[PDB]
Design a protein around this ligand. Structure first.
Ligand SMILES: *[C@@H]1O[C@H](CO)[C@@H](O[C@@H]2O[C@H](CO)[C@@H](O)[C@H](O)[C@H]2NC(C)=O)[C@H](O)[C@H]1NC(C)=O
Ligand SMILES: *[C@@H]1O[C@H](CO)[C@@H](O)[C@H](O)[C@H]1NC(C)=O
Ligand SMILES: *[C@@H]1[C@H](O)[C@@H](O)[C@H](CO)[C@H]1OS(=O)(=O)O
Length: 481
């Protein structure tokens, strides 16, 4: 019995069931999600390895070898056709072609489920999925449940990392026109105890941590690396439940009346589905989605408790973000360019500008230090790495407007995320490619001898697909200094 078999048994069946990690029905063996690769722009689907089983991650690794992959579609396993696709422009434009939101990397969110590798949906700011043509989803004041298993440590305070019911126009049509899980440390509207992040409910013109606008004491800060967020809503009732998706039970952080403010009772739900964005296409948020559903009707505590027990038995554990040669903390390296015609150039810097330059045993000591990097434990992720300047200690390679800069560590979360890179076996097979931890669609990429955090295709000039594989591949060499 999968989560959707459990909801079904409670007479509150799934009407949308979305996972890149596993089947949510014991008898589901169809496509979980679709991949598109940058090498030829073709697509494939990933299914469970067994009916009711875990995603075929090895089939993703095969399709995505020596290239980059986007998740184009998260299929609805319920049969309602409620597939999640690239989110369209709305009240806000996204950063992608015609104001669409970015697709997620296929490889930003590696996990194992009971020891078996799978991939979640790692969503950087500007990433979003949507279905504005959804069937069987609750509308008006009709009862619904939902849950998502999310990364409790991947979040920001920008609007809005949501999963659930939103507006079919992708615009703000008012209070009560949304009911979606929120995860992050936004304090623009609601917040809970501590420093966050919180699970809140986006009802539009508000994230609610409970009955009141703003502070509600009973909504705790989330500790867990994997968080089960379970939200439900009916006729002037709604609840927030939270669990460690790896251990134990759901606790109820809110349950009772609609917030007693203009437009939240009755609700005006439109039945659209969003992931990673606000209802109005607010696209500043980040977070990671592994699995989730939306139901018809108001699930009992008992149904959700059984879903949580099943989630625990799926045994979510952090996967490896790193492949290829990789590094040790304290090692000093030079990174050689492998692109034919630039194979004597190394990653260097001129002040804050990270670039490539010819470096050999006759270069000035100045340039030798600028082309030498102390590798340290990743500032935002201890599996990955940060690249510290030899000539400027305490300064690291960080992306900013997708250009690589050498900036001083200012101790902030944002700097740490922008300065964390995950070594990957080079796309051209010569050494390492360095994937952005925070924007895993992007890699260290030289373009006109300057370093960018470039995507394999995209809206920036430095995202050119020409020579991408070569331009993101670097040999790890003894530091000049
Ligand atoms: C959300 O949490 C982050 C991380 O703790 C907060 O980060 C601080 O943000 C301010 C400016 O926004 C910086 O000056 C601090 O240096 C940040 N701290 C760290 C450790 O990075 C952020 O403020 C929180 N947002 C809200 C609304 O509370
Ligand atoms: C593909 O990437 C792997 C890992 O770097 C490497 O062994 C292989 O040689 C590469 N092949 C091509 C065609 O680039
Ligand atoms: C409206 C968006 O669709 C929600 O995600 C967000 C919070 O409820 C709202 O933003 S607004 O700025 O309050 O309109």
């Amino acid at each position: 019995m999968g989560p959707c078999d459990i909801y079904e048994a409670g007479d509150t069946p799934c009407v949308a069931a979305h996972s890149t990690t596993r089947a949510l029905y014991s008898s589901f063996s169809g496509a979980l999600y679709q991949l598109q690769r940058g090498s030829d722009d073709t697509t494939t689907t990933i299914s469970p390895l067994t009916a009711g089983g875990i995603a075929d991650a090895s089939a993703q690794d095969t399709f995505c070898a020596n290239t980059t992959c986007l998740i184009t579609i998260i299929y609805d396993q319920s049969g309602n056709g409620n597939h999640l696709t690239q989110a369209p422009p709305g009240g806000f434009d996204g950063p992608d072609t015609d104001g669409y939101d970015n697709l997620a990397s296929a490889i930003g969110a590696p996990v194992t489920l009971n020891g078996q590798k799978a991939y979640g949906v790692f969503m950087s700011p500007g990433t979003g999925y949507r279905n504005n043509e959804a069937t069987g989803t609750a509308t008006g004041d009709e009862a619904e449940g939902m849950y998502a298993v999310l990364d409790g440590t991947h979040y920001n305070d920008a609007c809005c990392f949501d999963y659930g019911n939103a507006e079919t126009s992708s615009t703000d049509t008012g209070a009560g026109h949304m009911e979606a899980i929120y995860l992050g440390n936004s304090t623009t509207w609601g917040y809970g105890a501590g420093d966050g992040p919180w699970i809140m409910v986006d009802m539009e013109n508000n994230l609610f941590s409970g009955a009141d606008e703003g502070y509600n004491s009973g909504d705790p800060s989330i500790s867990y690396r994997f968080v089960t967020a379970a939200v439900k809503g009916g006729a002037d009732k709604w609840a927030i439940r939270g669990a460690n998706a790896a251990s134990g039970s759901l606790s109820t952080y809110y349950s009772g009346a609609r917030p007693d403010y203009s437009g939240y009772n009755p609700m005006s739900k439109e039945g659209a589905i969003i992931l990673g964005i606000g209802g109005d296409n607010s696209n500043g948020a980040q977070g990671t989605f592994y699995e989730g559903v939306m139901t018809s009707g108001y699930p009992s505590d008992d149904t959700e408790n059984s879903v949580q027990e099943n989630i625990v038995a799926a045994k979510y554990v952090v996967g490896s973000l790193v492949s290829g040669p990789s590094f040790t903390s304290g090692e000093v390296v030079s990174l050689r360019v492998t692109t034919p015609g630039y194979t004597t150039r190394y990653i260097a810097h001129t002040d804050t500008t990270v670039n490539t330059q010819v470096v050999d045993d006759d270069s000035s000591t100045t340039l030798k230090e600028e082309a030498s990097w102390t590798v340290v434990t990743g500032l935002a992720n201890s599996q990955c790495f940060s690249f510290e300047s030899v000539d400027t200690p305490g300064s690291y390679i960080r992306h900013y407007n997708f250009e690589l800069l050498l900036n001083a560590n200012d101790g902030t979360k944002q700097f740490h995320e922008d300065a964390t890179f995950c070594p990957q076996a080079a796309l051209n097979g010569e050494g390492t490619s360095l994937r952005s931890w925070s924007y895993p669609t992007r890699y260290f990429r030289h373009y006109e001898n300057v370093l960018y955090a470039a995507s394999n295709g995209g809206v920036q000039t430095f995202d050119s697909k020409t020579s991408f594989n070569n331009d993101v591949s670097f040999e790890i060499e003894t530091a000049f200094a």
